[PDB]
Structures are given as C-alpha cells and as structure tokens.
Amino acid sequence: ASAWPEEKNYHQPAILNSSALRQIAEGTSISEMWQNDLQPLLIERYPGSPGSYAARQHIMQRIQRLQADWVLEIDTFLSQTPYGYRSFSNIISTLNPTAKRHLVLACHYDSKYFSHWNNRVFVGATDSAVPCAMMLELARALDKKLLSLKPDLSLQLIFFDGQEAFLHWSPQDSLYGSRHLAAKMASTPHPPGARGTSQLHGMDLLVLLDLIGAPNPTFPNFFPNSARWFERLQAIEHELHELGLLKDHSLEGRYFQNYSYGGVIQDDHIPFLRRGVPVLHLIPSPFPEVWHTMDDNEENLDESTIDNLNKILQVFVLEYLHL
Numbered sequence: 001a002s003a004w005p006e007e008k009n010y011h012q013p014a015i016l017n018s019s020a021l022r023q024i025a026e027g028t029s030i031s032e033m034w035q036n037d038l039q040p041l042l043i044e045r046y047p048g049s050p051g052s053y054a055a056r057q058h059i060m061q062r063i064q065r066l067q068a069d070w071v072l073e074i075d076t077f078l079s080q081t082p083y084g085y086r087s088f089s090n091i092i093s094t095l096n097p098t099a100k101r102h103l104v105l106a107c108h109y110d111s112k113y114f115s116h117w118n119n120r121v122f123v124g125a126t127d128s129a130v131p132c133a134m135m136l137e138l139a140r141a142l143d144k145k146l147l148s149l150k151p152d153l154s155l156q157l158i159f160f161d162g163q164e165a166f167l168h169w170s171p172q173d174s175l176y177g178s179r180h181l182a183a184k185m186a187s188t189p190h191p192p193g194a195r196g197t198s199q200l201h202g203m204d205l206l207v208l209l210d211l212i213g214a215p216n217p218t219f220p221n222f223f224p225n226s227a228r229w230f231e232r233l234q235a236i237e238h239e240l241h242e243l244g245l246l247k248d249h250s251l252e253g254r255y256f257q258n259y260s261y262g263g264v265i266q267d268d269h270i271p272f273l274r275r276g277v278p279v280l281h282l283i284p285s286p287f288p289e290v291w292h293t294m295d296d297n298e299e300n301l302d303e304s305t306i307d308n309l310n311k312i313l314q315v316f317v318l319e320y321l322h323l
C-alpha cells in the first residue's frame with residue numbers, strides 16, 4: 001500500500017538563484033500576453049453562448065501551438081440551472097496524464113450573464129479573463145522548460161466553465177463546472193489501474209486564481225495546510241522586488257501580506273477543498289472595486305501589477321516542479 005499520496009506533504013521547492021530569477025523576469029511579456037492571450041477573451045462568454053465557444057477555442061488553440069506535450073480534454077456535462085437543463089464544458093490541459101502527482105493551476109473562463117445594459121456588455125476582465133491569460137502566458141513563457149518533462153510530478157491547468165450564478169449566488173446556482181469536475185476526479189482512479197487512489201489524491205495543490213488585474217491586490221493566507229506555499233509566494237515576491245525585477249512595486253504595498261482570513265469565500269476551490277485537496281486561493285480581499293459591474297473591463301486593469309504577478313507565479317511553478 002504505497003504512501004505516494006503523502007509525498008505532497010514533504011515536497012520542497014528547488015529555489016531559483018538570482019540569475020535564474022532575472023531570466024524568468026525577462027522571459028515573460030505582458031504586452032504579448034495582452035494582445036495574444038487576453039484581448040481575445042474580453043468578450044461576453046456566459047455558459048452556452050457563442051462567446052463561450054470562442055473562448056474555449058482560443059484557450060485550446062493557444063495551448064496547442066506550444067511545444068510542450070499538453071493533452072487537452074473538454075469535460076462536457078449537463079446540469080439543472082434556474083433556466084432549466086444546460087450544457088457546460090470545463091477545459092483541462094495536462095502534461096504527463098499518467099504522472100501520479102500534478103501541481104494544478106486553475107481559474108474560471110465563463111463570464112457572468114447580464115442582459116446588455118445601455119449598450120454595455122459584461123466581460124469580466126479581472127473575473128476572470130486576466131487569470132485565464134496569466135495561465136496561458138505562463139504556459140507560453142515556460143514552454144521550453146515544461147517541454148523537458150516530456151519526482152513523478154507534473155503540471156495541469158483547469159479552466160472551469162460555469163463558476164458564476166445565472167442569477168445571484170446560491171448553493172445550487174454557481175460552481176457548476178467545479179462541483180462537477182471535483183466529483184468526477186474524486187471517482188476516477190489514478191494513476192490508471194489503481195485500486196484505491198483517485199485523481200484528487202494526485203492533486204498536490206490547487207492554485208486557484210480569481211479576480212486578478214485591479215490595482216493594489218492583497219491576497220490573504222487562507223489555509224494552514226497551504227500556508228508554507230503562501231510563504232514561498234511572499235519570499236518570491238520579496239526577492240524579485242529586491243532584485244529590481246518588479247514594476248511600480250513597494251514592500252509596504254506588497255501583494256502577499258502576513259494576514260489570514262477566517263471566513264469562507266465561495267469559489268471553484270470549494271468542491272475540491274471539501275474533498276481534502278490542499279488549496280492556495282489567489283483571490284484578493286477585498287475584491288476589485290469594479291467586481292460584478294460593467295466597469296470590470298480592460299481600461300480598469302493595472303498592467304504592471306499583472307506583469308509582476310506573472311513573474312511571481314512563473315517562479316513559483318518552476319520552483320515547485322524543480323525546473
């Protein structure tokens with residue numbers, strides 16, 4: 001009876017030195033991400049809409065052009081909603097599908113439904129078009145390094161459909177894609193042929209990005225079982241800052257502060273957290289002032305803050321994977 005599902009408890013990062021940190025800082029391009037990964041997602045894309053289809057095609061195409069050996073799966077399912085039965089499609093992109101362990105980055109790609117109001121359309125720029133584009137830019141920026149994985153540990157990206165309530169949040173109207181995928185992963189043996197371990201036991205850590213892109217985000221350390229990984233984010237931010245590798249950034253206004261949040265925030269990590277998966281929840285508190293308004297748009301995004309977080313996240317992922 002293997003103790004492999006316990007490895008995540010002892011897993012340590014392989015920390016990058018200054019030279020490698022400068023390399024990662026220089027290897028990501030906020031302007032390329034903006035043009036190639038972000039702008040095509042700044043469209044209406046509530047579940048089942050033509051925009052959902054276009055967003056999903058864009059996400060798959062951007063991953064498909066990369067050199068690393070990504071395996072794309074579309075997880076399509078039905079769920080009851082306030083509007084009756086509807087179809088939803090999660091996007092899962094995985095390196096080394098049979099690898100026992102994966103570090104998982106995720107966000108939601110649907111946008112909240114709103115009827116057009118005075119000709120304005122809701123595009124959820126921070127919620128969560130930016131997180132989607134950050135995951136795509138990370139895949140692009142680290143592509144040569146990720147190609148090398150082609151420690152039975154690899155990387156997986158999940159873009160959830162249906163995170164948003166069709167009305168106002170309720171237990172039955174929200175988290176459609178995550179409630180479904182968590183249940184499916186919980187009931188899927190992993191690695192293939194296993195007798196008693198599931199894909200959820202294989203999830204070393206779920207790093208869920210949400211509501212990113214506004215100025216001065218502050219991310220609290222929500223959970224004690226991922227606190228040491230939150231501390232690594234703080235360390236990475238501090239070192240990139242001291243190396244002069246962040247833009248318009250100060251330690252007094254740092255993003256990862258020493259501070260917990262005891263309350264519960266409803267998001268896509270919930271169905272995973274309640275099945276025992278460790279979560280690093282990269283959602284700011286308080287939420288962007290533009291949250292769920294037509295002003296959550298491109299104009300209100302803070303370019304250098306997103307650039308800075310791309311660097312921190314990319315360093316975190318390489319250190320976790322020992323790349």
Ligand SMILES: [Zn+2]
Nearest residue numbers: 112127164292
């Ligand atoms: Zn939202």
